Assembly symmetry: D2
Homo-oligomer: 256 residues x 4
C-alpha cells in the first residue's frame, strides 16, 4: 500500500520515515545469508566492509531493489520517473562510526565562488505532493536498539535548513564529530530487522560510534529521477565538462 | 561575469540576450563548418538537426567550452558543471517550433505530477540555481516574427499553474505561436548573439515564412550528476532507464 | 470569479486587466462623484456612499478573493486625478532593499506572496478602476518591470538620477486600459506610470485589500521607539533619489 | 545577539530556548507583579490569563521593550517591529493547552491552507518570521506532568495539514494527552526565554502536579500587523480587524 497521510506528514516534517516490519523474519534471514554467500565467493575483505552494486552481485538483491514494498513509498516522496541510483550493503563491527553528511545548506567551494545549494538533494512540494530528487531506502538486517549499537542519528529539521552548520565548525578549529560530542537537536533512531528507514538525503545524518560486539547490517537503495546519473563520487568538475558524478558539500569527514 | 542588471533580467524573465558575443568572422567560420557536417531528420518539417556537434567537429568542441559561454552559464547554474548536449539546427521556409517547457506543466504517470525536477530552479544567498540552461548561439539574423523568431510565455519559468493541459482538454488544435496569446512575446537577435535560456521557460519559435536559412547551435549545461540529454518515453521496468521525460508540450496535441 | 487562464496570467505577470467591468453609466457616476470632492482623494469610502458601495462591489471582491485567499479587509480606497506633466515613478518590487538602521533587509512581508495547493496567497493587492482611456504612453500609461513581483535581486539600490519610467528599461512594459477596466495588481510588482504629456484628465479609483490582520494603509517612516508604531515602511522606491 | 548555531536551531526547529536571560531578582519582581494583579479578587490562584501586561504594569511595559527580548526577536523577524501582544499566564492543576499553530492547517472561508500571519521565509542570510513570541518563564518546568511545552517537530514548515483528518474521523482526544510520534517536550528553568515561531504547532501537556506555573508572553510582528485580537471570520463590510485561526485542537476536542 501507499503512504498514509500521517506518514507523508512525518516524512515531510522530519526528513525520514521508519516503516516497521516491511520484510518478514524469513526474508531478513535470506538477505543476511546472501551477504554471507558474497563473502564466500570473494574472501579477504576487512570485517567492516561495503558491498558495492548489490543488484549486479546478487539476483536476490536485484529483486529487492525493485520490490514494491520499497518502490511505492519511494514514488510517494520522489514523484518523478524513477531510476535506481545505487544499491549497496553495509557490514559494520565494533569501533566503526559514520560522521554527519548531508544537510540542506552546507557549503561547497566552487573554485571561484562558494555555493550553498546542492541540486541533487534540493527538494520541494507542489499541489499535494513531495518532490525529493534523492531518497534512500535503508533495509536493516539487524536490530539497533541503543546508541552504542551504532544507531542512525540525525540533526532535526536539517533537511530544510537555510543556514550552513559545518563550515563554521571547521573554521572554528573543531576536530570531533557531533555524533560523539552531542548537539542540542541530534536525535537517534532505533530499528528492528526488516524495518525500512526511508530517507530524504537532504537530511544531515550519520550513525553513533558502534561499541558493542556483533555485526551491524543493512542494505541501502538510492533512487532518484531518470535524468540523474547512477551514484558515483566526483571530487570536482572536470575541465572539459565531461566529468560525471556527485560532488559532496561540507561533511564532517573533511575535518574530523 | 554577468552584471547585476543581467542577473536581475535572467532571474525575472527566464532568459538573457547577450549581444555580439562572437564576431562576424567567427560566425562565418561556424557557418562554414555547419555546411559540411551531417544532419539528421528530427521529426519537425523543414528542419535539419546537427546532432552532437562537439563530437562531430573540433570547432564546436571548443565553442562548447568557450568562456564566453561558460562564464554566463556558471553564474546561473552555480553547480559543478557538465555539458549535457551540443547541437545545431537548420531551418527553411514554413518551419515552426511549438511551445515546450514551462515550470508547472503536467505529466501523467496512475498519478499526475506538476514538477519537472530537471528544470526546477531556485535562489539562495545571492545566487541563482538553475539546473538546466542552454546557450543558444545564433548564426543568422532574426529580426521579424516571420523569420521564425524565438518566442516565450512571460514568467512561465516560475509559473505555479499548468497552461497546456487545459488547452488540450478544451479541444485546441493550433499552437499559441500561430494563434497568439496575451503574454506570448518575441525575441529578436543578430548573428553572433547568445541567448542564455532557463529551460523552465515555456518557449518556441514563430513559423518561418521568409527565404534563407535559419541557423543556430545550442549548448545545454547542468550539474555533473545530470545525465547527458536524451529523450525518454517513460521510466523502464528495471528502473535502469536514463533520460528526460518531458511534460505536456504543444506537440502532443497541436 | 477568475478563470484558470486569468489566474495563470496574474501569477506569471503580477497583474491582470479585466476589461469592461463597469458600464459607461457607472463610470460617469464615479467621475461625477470625484468632481464633487473638489491630486489624490483620500479615503473615498468614508467620504462617499457611492465609493463605499464600490469598495464592496463583488466585481472587485471576487477577483481579489481569488488572489489573496485570506479573510479580507479593505486597507485603503483613494482616487487619483492627473493632468499633463504628472508622473508616477517606480515603486514596489519583491527584493528591493530597506535599511533598518542596524541592518539591511531584502524582504517586505506586507507584499511577500506565495502559492500552495492550487491557490495564490498575495497579502496586498489593488483593484485600480480606471475612469478614463489610457491608450498610449504619453497618456501616462501604467508601466511595470516584467517579473519584478518575483525578483530575487534588488534593482533600485544599485543605480541609486533619472527615472526608468523616462529613460526606459529592457523589461519595462506598458499597459493600456479603457474606461471601466480594472487593473488587478500584486503590490509586489515593481510599477509606476509614464509621464503624462497629453491634455485631459486622467482618472482612477484604487482599492487595496489584504488580510484581516493587516493594518489599514498609512506610510510609516520607521519603527517607533516604543514598538507601537502602526503602518507600512516602504522599501527602495524611485522617488527616493529622483 | 543570536549566534549562528542559535539561528540554525531556530530555523530548523521553529523555536529556541535561551537560558538564564533574567536573574532571580528580576523573576521575583515579575512573579510579584502577577500576584499584585491577583489581589483584585479574594481566593486562591486560578488558571487564568493576565491581559495587556504592558498597560497593567510599568514593570511589564519595560519587560516588553527589554533588549534581551528584542535583540533575538529582531534576528528572526527582520522587519520594522511592533509589539502585538503582552499577557501573563497562570496554570494550576488539571490545566491543559491543546495544539494550535501549524504551517499548513486548513481554514474554511473555499478551503485555504496558508495563514499569512505566520507564513515565514528566508532570504540572503536572514529569517523572515512575521509572528514570533518571546515566552518568559517564571517557574521551573522539568517534567511532562508539570505541563511542559510540547511541539510537533518540523510543523513550522509542514506542507500537509495534520488536524483536519483527525477531526473528520471523529477524534475527540488531544495529541497532548494521547501522544504523537513527533510530539516532543521542552523543559525550562525559571528565567529562561523560549523564543517561538508561531508557525510551529505547539501546546502544553496537562499539568498533573500541584504548585503553580507562571510565565509572561510577548508577541511581536511587523508594524503593519494589527495588535492581536481573535476574529471568527471577515466582517460584513470588510472593515473588521483581527486574526482568524485555522484548525486547532480546541475546535473538536
Ligand atoms: O548505517 C546507517 O544507519 C545509515 C548509513 C547511511 O546513511 C549511508 O550509507 O549513507
Ligand atoms: O530555434 C530557436 O530559436 C530555439 C530552439 C529551441 O528552443 C530548442 O531547440 O528547443
Ligand atoms: O496610476 C496608475 O495607473 C497606478 C497608480 C498606482 O500604482 C498607485 O496608486 O499606487
Ligand atoms: O504555556 C506555555 O508553555 C505556552 C503558552 C503558549 O503557547 C501561548 O500562550 O500562546
Ligand atoms: Cs510526452
Ligand atoms: Cs522611504
Ligand atoms: Cs476557528
Ligand atoms: Ni547517508
Ligand atoms: Ni527549446
Ligand atoms: Ni502603485
Ligand atoms: Ni501558543
Amino acid at each position: 500500500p501507499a503512504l498514509t497521510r500521517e506518514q507523508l506528514y512525518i516524512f515531510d516534517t522530519t526528513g525520514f520515515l521508519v516503516i516497521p516490519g516491511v520484510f518478514g523474519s524469513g526474508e531478513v534471514e535470506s538477505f543476511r545469508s546472501e551477504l554471507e554467500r558474497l563473502d564466500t565467493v570473494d574472501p579477504g575483505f576487512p570485517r567492516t566492509r561495503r558491498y558495492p552494486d548489490l543488484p549486479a552481485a546478487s539476483p536476490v538483491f536485484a529483486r529487492l531493489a525493485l520490490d514494491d514494498r520499497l518502490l511505492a513509498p519511494v514514488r510517494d516522496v520522489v514523484n518523478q520517473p524513477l531510476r535506481l541510483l545505487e544499491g549497496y550493503g553495509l557490514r559494520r563491527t565494533k569501533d566503526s562510526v559514520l560522521y554527519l553528511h548531508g544537510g540542506n545548506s552546507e557549503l561547497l567551494d566552487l573554485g571561484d565562488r562558494q555555493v550553498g545549494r546542492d541540486l541533487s538533494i534540493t527538494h520541494t512540494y507542489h499541489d499535494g505532493k513531495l518532490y525529493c530528487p534523492y531518497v534512500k531506502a535503508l533495509v536493516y538486517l539487524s536490530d539497533i536498539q541503543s546508541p552504542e549499537d551504532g544507531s542512525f542519528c540525525y540533526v532535526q529539521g536539517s533537511h530544510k535548513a537555510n543556514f550552513p552548520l559545518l563550515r563554521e565548525r571547521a573554521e572554528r578549529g573543531e576536530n570531533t564529530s557531533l555524533v560523539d560530542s552531542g548537539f542540542p537537536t541530534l536525535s537517534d533512531v532505533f530499528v528492528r530487522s526488516g524495518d525500512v528507514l526511508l530517507l530524504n538525503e537532504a537530511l544531515m545524518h550519520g550513525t553513533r560510534r558502534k561499541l558493542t560486539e556483533g555485526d551491524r547490517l543493512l542494505t541501502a537503495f538510492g533512487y532518484g529521477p531518470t535524468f540523474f546519473t547512477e551514484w558515483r563520487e566526483l571530487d570536482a568538475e572536470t575541465a572539459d565538462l565531461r566529468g560525471a558524478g556527485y560532488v559532496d558539500h561540507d561533511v564532517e569527514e573533511d575535518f574530523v
